[PDB]
Amino acid sequence: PTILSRFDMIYIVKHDVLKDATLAKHVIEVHVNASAAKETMFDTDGFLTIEFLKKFVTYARLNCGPRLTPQASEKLVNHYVKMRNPPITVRQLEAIVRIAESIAKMELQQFATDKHVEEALRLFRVSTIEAAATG
Amino acid sequence: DRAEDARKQEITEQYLNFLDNQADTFHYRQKIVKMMNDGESRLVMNLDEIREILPERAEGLLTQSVLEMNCLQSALQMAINRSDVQAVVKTGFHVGFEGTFGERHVNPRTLKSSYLGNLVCCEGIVTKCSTVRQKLLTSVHYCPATNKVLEKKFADFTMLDTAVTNNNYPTEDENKNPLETEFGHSVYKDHQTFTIQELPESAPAGQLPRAVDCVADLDLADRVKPGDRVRIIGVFRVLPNKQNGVSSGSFRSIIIINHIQMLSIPNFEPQDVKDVRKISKSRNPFELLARSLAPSICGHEETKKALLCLLLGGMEKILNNGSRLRGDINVLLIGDPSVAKSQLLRYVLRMAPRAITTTGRGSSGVGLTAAVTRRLEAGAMVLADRGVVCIDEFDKMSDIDRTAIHEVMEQGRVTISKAGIHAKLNARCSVLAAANPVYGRYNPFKSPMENIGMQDSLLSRFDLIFVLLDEHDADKDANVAEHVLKLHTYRTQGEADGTVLPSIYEENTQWAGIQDTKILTMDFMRKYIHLARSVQPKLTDEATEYISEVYADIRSFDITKTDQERTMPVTARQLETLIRLSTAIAKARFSKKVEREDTEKAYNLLHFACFKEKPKARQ
């Protein structure tokens, strides 16, 4: 329980059997197609290629460097005070700020806004409150 | 041959005219006068300054370095002979170089055989060292059979002089009379070798780092130890080898050193001294320094005052019978998680010269003090002598390791008596420590001593103890969150939005949060603390009376009156803490005397540390 403070996001992976029947059909069809096989931005299926994605990450890291807007900063103060006076810490606040900057980096933005802050808050709640509910 | 002699005469004359010009524009004659007054025997020159007046000498001094350097040292000897000061030193006078190298700035990886015979400048980390040893240069002998005196000179491949001789030690006269050595007249020199490796920031990934061997003599010996980051100037050269008249063609190469530069602190000018006078003459310099210490951390004002007192320090007293009284100050922080304990430790590690950081998680007491490895091996608190040790996660240390510190924190000594080893070691240093409470989080229903959970003999050795609590309170939560977001939205005034990191007062202060009151620059803080550390104040009668009354009041105060609870033990060491804090406060004023104005501030800080109101969960 000590080192859980050092991690920004936590998930618990966890009744699949009916949905897992469709997943079993898809996965075993993939493996039989792999057996049959045994016998440049986009892939054929519309997903991004690895050779483009790796280069794009290496480009973005050396060039973007965003900041928050003041209106984006105003929401977090109220959210912090409300959660703390209805385990809330400055570590969690700075983690949320880092996630909002990270989302704004992918769009190659000059600034992060209320949109990126709200998606960061949704991701933080969905990840972290599983540990509060479980164990 | 005679043309070579004429050219050498011309080159020596050119260097002599440069050194002993009638009105010296580069002041090397005055530097020679300084050298002979100080008793030193080598002169440092700027190759960039030789490059302006004699470029045909300067660029030839890189390619044909040996002959040019020999001519330059001969010219230096003639320039010394023109003085009215006498040549005391029996070894000759020498030259070192500095300046711009360009092509010949290299690494151990890029030193290759194209550079042999050239002057070079190289960088790296010292990885080995020989002990200093003495080497014969000339020998003087007396012949008792004839009353004559014989002399002989010696030379070696590692010397810059290319000349070689028989190198047999003389024992008999030409008439086969025996001889007697004159040890008081024979000449020896100090000698050392070492090696340098590539810097880890430059060595390519996966491969092993490459390395180069080095030879140093005379005043250049005994200057380095393993781990030093250095820049070294010398001639790159090759050494032949023989075994029974058969030679392998693979020869060894070295650097023969001329000059060494250390890469791993203060600086002053009279404008800076004027500004130090002005700020010392201002109204409240101690409060100004305490506010200016660490601006990007909100709150913690009393702890910042304590850290400033730690950086200044008290006065050691050594009495007439050899008895010693301690001068250093020791500080402990205990508190809830995410309250910037480790952040303040890292800041003090930046500010203090001679500082070391460790953790209690991965430290043995033997490694923390001294070790037997048979040999004796220094630990962290010995290495930080007359300095600062920062210890993080201090609650995670074992008590077997903690009991090894008790001698160091009071007597300033480490004593060992184990198999074959009996020794004292000096370990005079200041301890700054951070910890979490017993339960991992402060329990308000138990007393502060119960939450701290350490014995009185260890708790008494800390001058100041701070308990830091993370209380939920909407006003403080709003203020702290606003400060943190204001520090995160900041960007420098002369910077574009897309960029990435790969005078006296501060001017932009939105990041600092403090709205209007001024803040000093960190460089000015470093200079001011460096000067104020050397002030040596004395005590006075008003201070003595105030301290003596106040100590008795602190001991006799009873806590059942006020619904407070005691945070520290109170012993006779806390009286000395009052004396130390008074002298440390008086240093910041640049005062020669300790007064009631100092002692009142020291009492207020100590009384803040000693007592704490009960938590709101219990109230």
Added chain:
DNA sequence: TTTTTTTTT
């Protein structure tokens, strides 16, 4: 090689 001792992890 194998044996015996004292500090360290």
